[PDB]
Nucleic acid binder design. Structure first.
Lengths: 78, 98, 95, 90, 89, 98, 78, 95
DNA sequence: AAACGCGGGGGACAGCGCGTACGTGCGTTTAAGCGGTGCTAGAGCTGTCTACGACCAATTGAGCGGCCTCGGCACCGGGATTCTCGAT
DNA sequence: ATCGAGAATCCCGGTGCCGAGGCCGCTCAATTGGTCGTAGACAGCTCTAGCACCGCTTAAACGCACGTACGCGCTGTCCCCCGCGTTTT
C-alpha cells in the first residue's frame, strides 16, 4: 500500500515545498519517512480510541494525537 | 437580565468563558474579572485575524473568507506566525516562495 | 517546441504553491492508513474525517520537510535534493 | 456549543460586507479553543507557583504577556484592562 | 522532596552505591517532571471522555502515550502488579 | 496504621502521590488505584535510571552517583534519551563524539 | 558586557560540540545568538518575578521560563 | 616540536567532551545577565543559583547548536564552521 | 586573555567525464463517482450500587538538624600511550 | 604502510587531607482506618446511521520507454587564515 504514494505524488509535495530538482533515491526515502510519521500518529490515535472503548477512530482521536506530538491541526474540531 | 458580556462591552461570551474556566480543572476558584479579561483577549485576537483575512479575501476579489485567506493573514504577519508556529491550517496551503 | 529542463519544474512550483488541494490520491492513502492501523488493533473502523485529518497533517509535514531538505541541498551548492539532505533536516529537527 | 455566533458578530464589525465559509469557521473555532487553553493553562501554573487558589485578571494578564508575542501582548492587555474597567462600572 | 524514596530504591538496586546532593536534585526534578506529564495526560483523557475521575485506567493509558517502547511495557506491568497487591491488602 | 505504600509493596509514597493528584487541579475526583499505579510507575523509572547510573559510577571507579553518571545512563539508552529529549542535566556534560 | 564572552570561551563551547575548525566570523555570530537566547529566558523569568511581587529573580523563575520555552532544566529545584 | 594544525584542536575536543565544568567565566557572564535584565526591570536582585541556572542552560544551548552547526559544515564538505552553518541550523530548528 | 610570527591543511573556484533525472508521448491500470444495501457500532435513557468522597484521631514514617568517618580532591612518581620527525 | 628515537599529552598510584552525605535523635504533621452519604460508572436496550461492501461506468493519472541536456563528484590549483606557540598584560 506504501507504493500507492506514487513518484508523481511525492514530486507534487516537493513542488509545493519549492523543490526544483529531485534525485531518484528520494522517492523511497520519502515513503520511509511518511511511514514512520503515520505509524507514530496512528498509534496514539488508536490508544485514544481504545481508552474510549470505541471500535471507530474519530477525527478527534487524530487531532489529540497530533496535538500531543506538537503538530496541532486546525479545522477538524480543534 | 443584563449579560456580563454587555456590561464589559464585548461580543464574546463572559458567562460561557467563566463556566469553561470553572469546569476546566484550572484552579479551585475563579475571580469575577478573569472571564471578562480572557473574553476580551480572545475577541481582540479573533478581530485581528478576521480583519487581516478579510483584506486577503478582498485582494483575491472574494467576498467570503476561506482557510487560504486565514493562512495568508497568519503567515504574512511575523507576530501571528510566531503565535501559530506549530499550527497547521487545513486547506490553507503555503506561501509562494522560490 | 521543447521547454529546457527546469522551466516546467518552476511552473509546477508556482501552480502548487498557489493551490491548497491535497496532492496524494485519497483512495491509496486511505488503504495505507488502514494497513498501518491493523498492526495496532484489528477490525478498526475510521470516520471519513479521521482519514482526511491524517491526510492533511501528513501532506503538511512532508511539504515542511521538503522545504528544509531544499535549504540543505542549496547549502551544499546543489539544486537537486538527495537522501542526505532529508537525513540532515530530520537530524537537526530532532526527528 | 461553538464560538461561531461570536466570530460572525466580530467579523461583521471589522468587515460588514465580508462572509465566511464553514471550513474557515472551523479554523476560527479551533483557534479560539487553542488560545483559551494556552492562557488558562499558564494562568493555572502561575496560581500554583505562587500558592494561590484563585485565577484572577492578574493571572490572565501575566499569562497574556508570557504567551502573546510583541505588540500582540501590548494591545491584548489594553483590551482586557478596558473590559474589566467597563465591567466594574457596569 | 522524594530524596528518602530515591535513596531507598538506590539501596535496593545498588546496596554499596551512594549519591551526591547534585545528583539527588536531578532525581527529584525527574520524578516531579514525569509526575506532571502523566497526571496532565490523565487529566486530558478524563476531560476528553467527559469523566470527572482520574482512575488507574487513565494512568495506564497516559503511560502508554508518554513512555517509549519497552519502558511503557514494564511500567504498565509494575503499575498493574501494585494495584493487584493493594486490592488484596 | 498500615501505609498504602506497604499495602502495594512500594517504596514510593502512595499517600503523598494521592494528595498531589487531589491538589494538582487534574480532576474533580481521584480513584483509589490511581496513586498506587502512578507511584509504582515513578518507582520503576527511578530504579531503571539509578541502576544504569550506578553501573556508570562503577565503570568510573566511583562509589557515589554524580550528575555525569545520570547523563551517561540517559544518553546511552535510546528509550531514556527519547523520554528526556528536551531535558538538560545540570553538570551532566555531553557524550564523547567526534 | 557581551565582549566578556571571549573567543577562547566560545572555542571551548565549540570543542565540547565536537568542532575542529572555526571561522573568525563565528565569534560575533555566537555572541548575537547567545544575546537573543538570554533575552528570551530573562524576559520570562522577570515576568514571573514581577507576578510574585518580588524584587529578586529566583532559580525557580529561571526554571519556569526555561520549561515554557521547551528547554527543561534538571538540578535547580525542578 | 610543533604539533600539526588540528592535533591540539582534537585533544581539546577529547578534554572538553570528558569534562562537565562550565566553560564561560562566571563573573563576565553574571555582568551580561544583569545588563540584559536591566532593560526589563530596574534595581533587580538575583539569587546566586538563578545566575548559575541561566549559565547552565546557555552553555547547554550553545554546545547543542555547535553540534548541529558542525553537521551543516560537514554537509557542505567543509571541516570549518561558518556563520552560514549556524544560520541554517537555527532556521531548520525553527529558531 | 590579548597580540604578533609563520604556515601548510583547508576552502573556494575552474575542468570535465558521466550518470541521471527532467520532458514528452503511448498504453493500463486504477482511482473517482454514482447508486444501493447492512448491520455493527456510536449515541441517548433508565435503574443501582459500588466506588468515590467528608471529618477527623493518631502514631508512626518522614523531614530538620547533627556529628562524624570514609570516599573524593589533590600532589608528586612514574608509566606507558600519542604524536613528530627521519628511513626500508 | 612500517619502524624507531624524541618529546609530550594522559592514566595509574601511593600519600595526605578535608568536606559532606549517612546513621542517629528529635519533632510535628499527615496517612490510614473508620463510618456514613452520595454520585456517576455499568449494563442493558433501543434506535439509527455511516461508512464497508458490491457493481458498474468513466476518464484521468501512473509506468515505461526513450531522448537528451545538466548538475555531481572528484581533481587539481591558488591564496590565505585559524592555529600553535610565545610573550606580555
Amino acid at each position: 500500500n506504501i507504493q500507492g504514494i506514487t513518484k508523481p505524488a511525492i514530486r507534487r509535495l516537493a513542488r509545493r515545498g519549492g523543490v526544483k530538482r529531485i534525485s531518484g533515491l528520494i522517492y523511497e526515502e520519502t515513503r520511509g519517512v511518511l511511514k514512520v510519521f503515520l505509524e507514530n500518529v496512528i498509534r496514539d490515535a488508536v490508544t485514544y480510541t481504545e481508552h474510549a472503548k470505541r471500535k471507530t477512530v474519530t477525527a478527534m482521536d487524530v487531532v489529540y494525537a497530533l496535538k500531543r506530538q506538537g503538530r496541532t491541526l486546525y479545522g477538524f474540531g480543534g | 437580565a443584563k449579560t456580563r458580556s454587555s456590561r464589559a462591552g464585548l461580543q464574546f461570551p463572559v458567562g460561557r468563558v467563566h463556566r469553561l474556566l470553572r469546569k476546566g480543572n484550572y484552579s479551585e476558584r475563579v475571580g469575577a474579572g478573569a472571564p471578562v479579561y480572557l473574553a476580551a483577549v480572545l475577541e481582540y485576537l479573533t478581530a485581528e485575524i478576521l480583519e487581516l483575512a478579510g483584506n486577503a479575501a478582498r485582494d483575491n476579489k472574494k467576498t467570503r473568507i476561506i482557510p487560504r485567506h486565514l493562512q495568508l493573514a497568519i503567515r504574512n504577519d511575523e507576530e501571528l506566525n510566531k503565535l501559530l508556529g506549530r499550527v497547521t491550517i487545513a486547506q490553507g496551503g503555503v506561501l509562494p516562495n522560490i | 517546441h521543447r521547454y529546457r529542463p527546469g522551466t516546467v519544474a518552476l511552473r509546477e512550483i508556482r501552480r502548487y504553491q498557489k493551490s491548497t488541494e491535497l496532492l496524494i490520491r485519497k483512495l491509496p492513502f486511505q488503504r495505507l492508513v488502514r494497513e498501518i492501523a491493523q498492526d495496532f488493533k484489528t477490525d478498526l473502523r475510521f470516520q471519513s474525517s479521521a482519514v482526511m485529518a491524517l491526510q492533511e497533517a501528513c501532506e503538511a509535514y512532508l511539504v515542511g520537510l521538503f522545504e528544509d531538505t531544499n535549504l540543505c541541498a542549496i547549502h551544499a551548492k546543489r539544486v537537486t535534493i538527495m537522501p542526505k539532505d532529508i537525513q540532515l533536516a530530520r537530524r537537526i529537527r530532532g526527528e | 456549543e461553538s464560538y461561531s455566533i461570536y466570530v460572525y458578530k466580530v467579523l461583521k464589525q471589522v468587515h460588514p460586507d465580508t462572509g465566511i465559509s464553514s471550513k474557515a469557521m472551523g479554523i476560527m473555532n479551533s483557534f479560539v479553543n487553542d488560545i483559551f487553553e494556552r492562557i488558562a493553562g499558564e494562568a493555572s501554573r502561575l496560581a500554583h507557583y505562587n500558592k494561590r487558589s484563585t485565577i484572577t485578571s492578574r493571572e490572565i494578564q501575566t499569562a497574556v504577556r508570557l504567551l502573546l508575542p510583541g505588540e500582540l501582548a501590548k494591545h491584548a492587555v489594553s483590551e482586557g484592562t478596558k473590559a474589566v474597567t467597563k465591567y466594574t462600572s457596569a
